Amino acid sequence: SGAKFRISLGLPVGAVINCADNTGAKNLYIISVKGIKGRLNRLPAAGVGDMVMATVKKGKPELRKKVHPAVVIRQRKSYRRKDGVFLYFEDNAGVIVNNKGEMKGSAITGPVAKECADLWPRIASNAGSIA
Template identity: 55%
Template structure:
């Protein structure tokens, strides 16, 4: 995992239901906690593009349901500013399941992946079809 420059807008708060866009069998995951989040005391944790978080699988195959997994946000609907000053937003939220070390659990990703997530997680960039 590489560090990211600048401040990003975190658009997915605790408890958010996020579609999983890989082929691991999970369809919908719920955000439990954000890894490596250093923030103000008693502030509700939120995840943004490129953040790793802990999630619970809410919908999916029977062997995946109710498992606690790690995931990375690859798209978010809330607009955020890039380093060059442009604002970007996607039409949906999306996440990809990963191992605690950052290895992708699936073998393909449906839809585009944000450049911030691809730069921070090289294994996600390797299997993504489109990087925006």
């Protein structure tokens, strides 16, 4: 199998990231990160490939005042890929999924990180390109 390695997170609670799928939502506002035990005063932060709980601030009115599971696919914070490559993207992006991992939308705009693609096959299926 193989588990995901540690990467630089750079997206704490409260970050507003783009919504890269065609669900009609424009951005995702991160409220928490899955799998975070915690630490006093430490903000839960997420990297690419992490499940987060997010609410959309602008977009279709039927998605706004709800909490959606989301997965980060791109991030601006540079992270190491265990082979000396420090990679970062042009923007922070995520897609809206369910707790089983399948996306609510059907297409993804822009590249998707290899860590996110390898750990979510359903997101990797709809990714136009993988970085």
